[PDB]
Write a protein that binds this ligand. Sequence first.
Ligand code: MG
Ligand code: MG
Lengths: 305, 305
Amino acid sequence: SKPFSLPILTLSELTNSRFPVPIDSLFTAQNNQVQCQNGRCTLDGELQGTTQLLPTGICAFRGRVTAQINQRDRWHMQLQNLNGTTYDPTDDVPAPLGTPDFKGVVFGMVSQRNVGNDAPGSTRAQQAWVSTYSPQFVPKLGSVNLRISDNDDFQFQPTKFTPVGVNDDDDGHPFRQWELPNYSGELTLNMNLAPPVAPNFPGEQLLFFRSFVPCSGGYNQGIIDCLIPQEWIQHFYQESAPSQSDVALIRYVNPDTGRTLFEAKLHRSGYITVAHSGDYPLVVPANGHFRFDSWVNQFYSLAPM
Amino acid sequence: SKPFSLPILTLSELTNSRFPVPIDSLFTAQNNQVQCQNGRCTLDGELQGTTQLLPTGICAFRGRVTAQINQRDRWHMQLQNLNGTTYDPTDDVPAPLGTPDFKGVVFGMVSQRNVGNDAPGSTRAQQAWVSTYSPQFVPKLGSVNLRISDNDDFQFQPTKFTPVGVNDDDDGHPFRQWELPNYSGELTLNMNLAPPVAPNFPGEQLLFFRSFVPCSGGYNQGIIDCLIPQEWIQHFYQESAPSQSDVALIRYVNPDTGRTLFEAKLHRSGYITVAHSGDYPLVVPANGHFRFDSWVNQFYSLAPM
Ligand SMILES: [Mg+2]
Ligand SMILES: [Mg+2]
């Protein structure tokens, strides 16, 4: 069997798998549903949820604007897959890969480049917002609607949305990173979801890779927590190493000193638990990183943090 | 010796190492200086130029806004390294890692999050532009100046620049992807550069990984060509396989059929040549990818493309 491994990367050499920014810190959370759809991959390399491989694809959209309606979510964007191929709403996924997996507003920019009969090759770009609370946020069905800055400089042409940050909506719908959008809109149930994750052994908590992402006004901290970073997902996809048991024991090491600072359980479906009680932001040395130790089972007792 | 290898990734699973977008196509160019500084890495895993590991770091800036001056490039941004550590202008690099490596305008957004005594935690974000033609574009010295949309909603606070696309500057300053900026400004020479690259065998041309990136007005095609994609750089940094000669023979394979479509030379300093004459956009199958074949040398004659 090909041996399992992690890439050797410090926290600042890691990308959040749920928003296209670096990891800032590690955080373990008090128990009490975690069911994110980006940043989902098994240790033997099976992508799940809406997870795809490119960091620049996370919370991005690609397609064409085809209509406008007289509502706040004005501009109707018919989606393609991020690689430009035609999107199939009957595929066994929750939504096009890369679609945001939280309730809130994503802010960034839209850009267009004309094709066909109308001024082919002409371009434009401007600030835009996507509300995942919108009744027109129906990416599983094949479209989302955009709010933009200048309604007079926008055409029915090929369009890309590049995310920059997140926020609460100004009408009081809050940014809730653990609440899934309704991918097919009002009165529909989400399907083909990656499953919820939780500790299943006494005294254990989830460990997250945390980023503080940009916000566009107000005091929101911009916290987005992922289960495993994007480079680990990319690595597992390449390696496809067989999982020899349900849990990989991993050690956080300081390579300068060679010491192990703490240990953790990396579960086969792609998340980490540690032995601790209470919310705790880790403050650990900058050169620190995890290494694979050995395969153990679900009932292995971790050294307390 | 540890065996050299490439990651197994199709073109739409690859990221441009000179701008944070996917690869669109492969392109070989007529001969006649190529000396880009992002996307530079040796086959044995040594990053060069201004190259760092994260796609989200390419053409990004991090720092603090500290002053404003009364001209178009108005807001003075004192730079940090992208991981937030203090930038040392005496280090052996051309500029902070991630700095753009072309002449033109990069457009995107700025975001702020206050620290210290003045409304800590308050945030704001808006459209911004960085001109690499500016006499205030002096990232090696530790600063760049920004143009922004709303001069009245911007503070002397921690600031991030997120790039979205590129364009020509007006008044006759064009987007020139092969012209390096003056990293220390007018009348100073760039230093610590990754070397220029060129074919050294008759009948050979460079092969590029090409993207058509967003533009913010006008008809520019947005072409940014890189020598090797970001995932290859990330892979070589991890693997650190010894280079057994100055030249690696690689083959472009269609995994569907098992056929080799063409072969190329992958040089030790991290670029590719093919045997062809003239500008040529390749049109090859979607599942195609390069594989390493064997170590060869400068006298190997490539099969014509
Ligand atoms: Mg390991
Ligand atoms: Mg290979």
